[PDB]
Design an enzyme around this catalytic site. Structure first.
Site, short mmCIF file in Angstrom:
data_model
loop_
_atom_site.label_atom_id
_atom_site.label_comp_id
_atom_site.label_asym_id
_atom_site.label_seq_id
_atom_site.Cartn_x
_atom_site.Cartn_y
_atom_site.Cartn_z
N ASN A 1 -2.47 -1.93 -3.71
CA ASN A 1 -3.54 -0.98 -3.51
C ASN A 1 -3.44 0.12 -4.57
O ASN A 1 -2.42 0.81 -4.65
CB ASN A 1 -3.46 -0.35 -2.13
CG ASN A 1 -4.51 0.70 -1.93
OD1 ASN A 1 -5.69 0.37 -1.81
ND2 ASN A 1 -4.12 1.97 -1.95
N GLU A 2 -4.50 0.27 -5.36
CA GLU A 2 -4.64 1.35 -6.33
C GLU A 2 -3.35 1.60 -7.11
O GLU A 2 -2.75 2.67 -7.01
CB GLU A 2 -5.10 2.63 -5.64
CG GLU A 2 -6.39 2.50 -4.86
CD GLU A 2 -6.94 3.85 -4.40
OE1 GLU A 2 -6.25 4.88 -4.61
OE2 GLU A 2 -8.04 3.90 -3.81
N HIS B 1 0.84 -1.19 0.00
CA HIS B 1 0.00 0.00 0.00
C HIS B 1 0.88 1.25 0.00
O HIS B 1 0.86 2.03 0.96
CB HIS B 1 -0.92 -0.03 1.23
CG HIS B 1 -2.16 0.80 1.11
ND1 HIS B 1 -2.13 2.18 1.02
CD2 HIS B 1 -3.47 0.45 1.14
CE1 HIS B 1 -3.37 2.64 0.99
NE2 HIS B 1 -4.20 1.61 1.05
#
Ligand SMILES: *[C@@H]1O[C@H](CO)[C@@H](O[C@@H]2O[C@H](CO)[C@@H](O)[C@H](O)[C@H]2NC(C)=O)[C@H](O)[C@H]1NC(C)=O
Ligand SMILES: *[C@@H]1O[C@H](CO)[C@@H](O[C@@H]2O[C@H](CO)[C@@H](O)[C@H](O)[C@H]2NC(C)=O)[C@H](O)[C@H]1NC(C)=O
Ligand SMILES: *[C@@H]1O[C@H](CO)[C@@H](O[C@@H]2O[C@H](CO)[C@@H](O)[C@H](O)[C@H]2NC(C)=O)[C@H](O)[C@H]1NC(C)=O
Ligand code: NAG
Ligand code: MAN
Ligand code: MAN
Ligand code: MAN
Length: 542
Positions: A220-221, A173
């Protein structure tokens, strides 16, 4: 102790040292813990639409919350952790890049998690999404493993399950190891060391936790993360041949590779009986915007270009035909490394589950100076999507009215676009089908100027966040029953006010208030936490 680690932290702390929290001991939850009282019964009475009366999410639906290691943990130097690029950034450019905050302490969840989990159990939350700090496991990104870091998440996962919380793990992340950035440019690596280093790290955490964590996200993203690689501190260390524009697409390629290879390892670990079988994907974000003028071929084209650059560039290689979208290839050319046949063998089909951080839906206005003109000008401010990217367009109909309620103006990308959720889920599940279905893996609200309230009662009656979470949950419930979406869960960002990257603790996403002027960082439930709890009571199977 390791000397290279000390050198890295000396570097990070050259202008000012890491601050240490007032509590550096694992807190224990007394059995007589008293929760603050419930809000008035009229606060949420008859608050949901009648259209969802009696409807329930499927059995096993993950009804939960999301956090990320560097945003909630603190303990930045505790128990062997090495620094991430964000530790460096904020300790060196705090005033210009980090709104005068740093992630040294944030919510101190590293030590307060048992207390946090007891408070989440009080709300009936059944799922806890977290990320693992790479530099707690490999403090230099690669090389020696930090057993204290591995043992920490052992205890987190065990505590979560004790409090009724199914753990959902994110491997990465955004907390890139500083050591890898300095050594070879990390995700800008023009070789493949970053892939090897990520896969070794992912293998270690899969082995250690795969018997208890059965839902995994690699990245994440990744689209949002790779666009940060165009700024500090990444652009202090670009390899030869890389600039701040091509850094974004070199990152895209390296992440896709790292994801495919890590998923391959995960499947090997399951197939060999080393770990329990689970499911793995990555967290997508953003949306397929609605055209500003429906039926207008230009707005429709820019809408699809937006989807392609914000979702398809990662989702099409993984869940679709195995290559980048054509509109992406045609515009970015050789800044984006081509996916070889061997690459595609790892990446295609490497997502058991789709996950969308479905915060909002935008509106796409084609570039006023023409899409064809924009596409060819790398210097155009709307390149490469070639819609009008600024707020007065991205959120606004031709009428001049917004698509919906805006949140805090420092997070202007965020609006309540609940009426569009069902269309986004239909598009995503038809375009990027995954056998395991789709998670709404993040959704939440930044209540406008909540950081300027001085009195607690003004903070805790958070009407627009309450509305947002209830609106969104209601639309998710209707997507299941009306549209047949295979929706696996809903995770709200977040359970606590936390450290929001460059904005620091100023931006408030929690359905609990964290008192940053108190040594204990006391949590208080906002109304939205009780609205979330009540929705779970009314619409989950028990
Ligand atoms: C490296 O990244 C930083 C962002 O962290 C970029 O900063 C921009 O710098 C230009 C030049 O002064 C300013 O116009 C922008 O306002 C800055 N943006 C931010 C967010 O501070 C910097 O441009 C990048 N350096 C490059 C591309 O070489
Ligand atoms: C960063 O690198 C890319 C290439 O990696 C540069 O884009 C090239 O720009 C030259 C000059 O117009 C063109 O001949 C090439 O066709 C471009 N490559 C592309 C777009 O594939 C880009 O200009 C560099 N950016 C900056 C500002 O340094
Ligand atoms: C590519 O886009 C750049 C950035 O918009 C354009 O450069 C601008 O040119 C206009 C012409 O009137 C000037 O008003 C701006 O001062 C320029 N800004 C910058 C930063 O250069 C450039 O014209 C575009 N090139 C095209 C259309 O081929
Ligand atoms: C946060 O805690 C501090 C210190 O105990 C107290 O001064 C302040 O009133 C609290 N602020 C709130 C609850 O808004
Ligand atoms: O050392 C005291 C300190 O230890 C740790 C936690 O258990 C805290 O609750 C406690 O105050
Ligand atoms: C906070 O303070 C402690 C000293 O008590 C350090 O060990 C830590 O690194 C941080 O600087
Ligand atoms: C947590 O760590 C700090 C570091 O200074 C100590 O002061 C404290 O006693 C606790 O061990």
């Amino acid at each position: 102790g390791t000397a290279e680690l000390d050198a890295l932290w000396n570097l990070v702390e050259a202008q000012y040292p890491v601050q240490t929290a007032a509590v550096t001991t694992l807190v224990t939850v007394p059995d007589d813990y008293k929760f603050e009282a419930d809000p008035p019964s009229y606060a949420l009475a008859g608050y949901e639409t009648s259209e969802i009366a009696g409807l329930k999410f499927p059995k096993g639906f993950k009804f939960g919350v999301a956090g990320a290691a560097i945003q909630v943990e603190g303990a930045a130097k505790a128990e062997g952790r090495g620094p991430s690029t964000w530790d460096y950034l904020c300790h060196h450019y705090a005033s210009t890049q980090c709104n005068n905050y740093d992630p040294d302490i944030t919510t101190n969840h590293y030590y307060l998690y048992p207390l946090d989990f007891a408070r989440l159990q009080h709300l009936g939350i059944n799922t806890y999404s977290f990320s693992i700090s790479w530099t707690r496991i490999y403090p230099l990104g690669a090389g020696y493993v930090n057993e204290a870091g591995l043992a920490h998440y052992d205890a987190v996962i065990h505590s979560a399950k004790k409090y009724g919380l199914e753990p959902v793990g994110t491997v990465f992340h955004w907390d890139t190891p500083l050591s890898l950035m300095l050594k070879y440019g990390a995700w800008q690596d023009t070789g493949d060391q970053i892939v090897k280093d990520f896969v070794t790290y992912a293998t270690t955490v899969f082995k250690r936790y795969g018997n208890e964590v059965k839902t995994w996200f690699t990245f994440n993203e990744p689209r949002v993360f790779c666009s940060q690689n165009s700024g500090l501190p990444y652009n202090l260390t670009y390899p030869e041949g890389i600039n701040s524009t091509s850094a974004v697409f070199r990152c895209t390629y390296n992440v896709l590779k790292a994801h495919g290879h890590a998923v391959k390892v995960y499947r090997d670990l399951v197939a060999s009986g080393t770990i329990a079988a689970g499911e793995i994907g990555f967290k997508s974000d953003d949306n397929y915007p609605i055209p500003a003028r429906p039926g207008n071929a230009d707005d429709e084209e820019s809408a699809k270009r937006h989807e392609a650059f914000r979702i398809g560039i990662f989702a099409q290689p993984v869940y679709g035909n195995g290559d980048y979208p054509d509109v992406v290839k045609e515009t970015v050319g050789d800044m984006l490394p081509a996916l070889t046949d061997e690459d595609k063998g790892y990446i295609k089909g490497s997502g058991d589950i789709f996950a969308i951080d479905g915060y909002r839906t935008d509106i796409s206005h084609a570039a006023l100076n023409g899409i064809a003109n924009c596409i060819r000008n790398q210097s155009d401010p709307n390149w490469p999507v070639c819609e009008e990217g600024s707020d007065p367009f991205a959120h606004v109909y031709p009428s001049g009215f917004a698509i919906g309620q805006s949140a805090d103006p420092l997070s202007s990308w965020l609006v309540n676009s609940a009426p569009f959720i069902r269309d986004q889920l239909k598009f995503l599940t038809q375009t990027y089908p995954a056998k395991g279905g789709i998670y709404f893996s993040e959704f939440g609200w930044a209540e406008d100027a909540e950081y300027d309230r001085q009195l607690l009662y003004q903070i805790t009656w958070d009407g627009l966040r309450t509305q947002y979470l209830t609106d969104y949950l209601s639309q998710l419930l209707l997507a299941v029953h009306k549209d047949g979406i295979n929706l696996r869960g809903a995770l709200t960002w977040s359970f606590v006010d936390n450290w929001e990257w460059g904005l620091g603790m100023q931006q408030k996403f929690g359905f609990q208030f964290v008192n940053q002027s108190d040594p204990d960082l006391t949590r208080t439930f906002k109304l939205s936490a009780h609205a979330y709890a009540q929705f779970g009571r009314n619409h989950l199977h028990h």
